[PDB]
């Protein structure tokens, strides 16, 4: 991302592709390393009635 536009143009010409649109080095677009806490759902057997295990 820090490449100058001359090197960027030479690089896009040599590859034949627009390389800045799809960079293989990751930057600020990726997820944060600290996330909010999850609240995971429970399955269908988490019920207080009609939940006999033999069924």
């Amino acid at each position: 991302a820090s490449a100058t536009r001359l090197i960027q143009g030479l690089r896009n010409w040599a590859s034949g592709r627009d390389l800045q649109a799809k960079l293989q080095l990751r930057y600020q677009e990726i997820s944060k390393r600290t996330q909010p806490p999850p609240k995971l759902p429970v399955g269908p057997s988490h019920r207080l009635s009609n939940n006999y295990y033999c069924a």
């Binding site: 207080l48 009635s49 009609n50």
Partner: protein
């Protein structure tokens, strides 16, 4: 006959129910007790069992088992062991105070019932297991038993018939479970009042391991009147398979709470409005009725309008007749608090023997204590329903059934009131 109730005073078995006459031997013989008892004893066990079977008498303890069929389980030759009648006088059911009145006011009627029933079943003696809280009633019955021994009516050569028969009184010590017949047998034997598993039924292995019939005070005390008046007289009252008269204990929210003898298939509305002075605030103030003491499920006002107070019509009203103890609850009643107090009774009165009652009755009391406050969520209602269904039929005796049934009646007739209780808890506490 299609309509029932309005029982005449000449057809009352329990005259002197109210203590207005002499309960002693002169007053009892002046009212018809101990009359031609020798002629009843000399006609044999088969005649007495035939009179009790013809009378249609069912078990007045609360289950309603046929009394003559039950007592004929003892009609068999001896195998070396003595035979025993045991009279269940524990009467721990909330709402129920009728056997107290029989013991306290008609004691010689109970003693003559012990003699006639023990002759019918070939019993050696009678053990009247009385409640220990009924101390004055027990001493009252002991004075009447002393009068019956001193008159030669019981004991060696009872009533001049050549049949020897003792009558013992054993006092309880404060356990509602000791009215269940096998737990009562274990309590007589000097142990914890824990019910035995059936089989053996007490006619095979009962008190001291002997053949035994445990029978209620009321179903014992009506038996000399059945033998004198005839079984066809006693079967002329009430519906078919619902024969006779019955003591009713109308308590709770009525104007005049009382014990009254009444014909069997009397309407509940007629009984309350005739003998109890009606519901406080009128019949329109009625919320619910527990028809037969605490173990029967409640029925709301819409069921109470036309229901009959015998066994079969209350089974069709998905409750029980039980002890015929009518607990009336008006519109000002916190009905969840009353049913939860009843479940609190059933966990304080639970002998702890088997797992579903010992654990689940306490767990139902905790759930009901949260349902009173509303500190719950509606998915716990059906959960509680299933908990009751995991106690019902899975226990040793029917105290688990008698604790599951009020929960089931409360849920079945008052689920929306539980739900609005919980949602107002949720909106004023969150």
């Amino acid at each position: 006959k299609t309509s029932f109730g309005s029982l005449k005073d000449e057809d009352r078995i329990f005259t002197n129910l109210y203590g207005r006459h002499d309960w002693r031997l002169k007053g009892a013989q002046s009212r018809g007790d101990w009359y031609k008892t020798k002629e009843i004893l000399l006609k044999g066990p088969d005649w007495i069992l035939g009179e009790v079977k013809t009378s249609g008498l069912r078990g007045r303890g609360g289950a309603g088992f046929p009394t003559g069929l039950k007592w004929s389980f003892m009609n068999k030759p001896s195998d070396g062991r003595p035979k025993y009648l045991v009279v269940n006088a524990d009467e721990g059911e909330p709402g129920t105070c009728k056997d107290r009145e029989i013991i306290r006011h008609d004691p010689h009627k109970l003693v003559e019932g012990c003699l006639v029933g023990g002759r019918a079943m070939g019993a050696r003696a009678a053990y009247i297991y009385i409640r220990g809280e009924f101390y004055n009633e027990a001493s009252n019955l002991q004075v009447a038993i002393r009068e019956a021994y001193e008159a030669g009516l019981i004991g060696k050569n009872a009533c001049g018939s050549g049949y020897d028969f003792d009558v013992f009184v054993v006092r309880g010590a404060g356990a509602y479970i000791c009215g269940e017949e096998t737990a009562l047998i274990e309590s007589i034997e000097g142990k914890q009042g824990k019910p035995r598993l059936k089989p053996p039924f007490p006619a095979d292995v009962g008190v001291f391991g002997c053949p035994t019939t445990v029978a209620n005070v009321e179903t014992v005390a009506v038996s000399p009147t059945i033998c004198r008046r005839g079984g066809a007289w006693f079967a002329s009252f009430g519906r078919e398979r619902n024969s006779g008269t019955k003591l009713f204990n109308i308590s709770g929210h009525v104007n005049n709470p009382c014990t009254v003898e009444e014909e069997m298939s009397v309407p509940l509305k007629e009984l309350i409005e005739k003998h109890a002075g009606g519901v406080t605030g009128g019949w329109d103030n009625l919320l619910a009725v527990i028809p037969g003491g605490s173990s029967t499920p409640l029925i709301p006002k819409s069921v109470c309008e036309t229901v009959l107070m015998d066994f079969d019509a209350l089974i069709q009203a998905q409750t029980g007749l039980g002890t015929a103890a009518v607990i009336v609850m008006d519109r000002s009643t916190d009905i969840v608090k009353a049913i939860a107090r009843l479940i609190e009774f059933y966990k304080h009165e639970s002998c702890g023997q088997c797992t579903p009652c010992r654990e689940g009755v306490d767990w139902m009391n905790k759930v009901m204590a949260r349902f009173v406050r509303g500190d719950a969520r509606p998915a716990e209602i059906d959960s509680l329903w299933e908990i009751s269904k995991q106690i019902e039929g899975h226990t040793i005796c029917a105290l688990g059934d008698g604790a599951a049934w009020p929960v089931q009646g409360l849920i079945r007739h008052f689920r929306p009131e539980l739900e609005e209780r919980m949602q107002r808890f949720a909106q004023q506490h969150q």
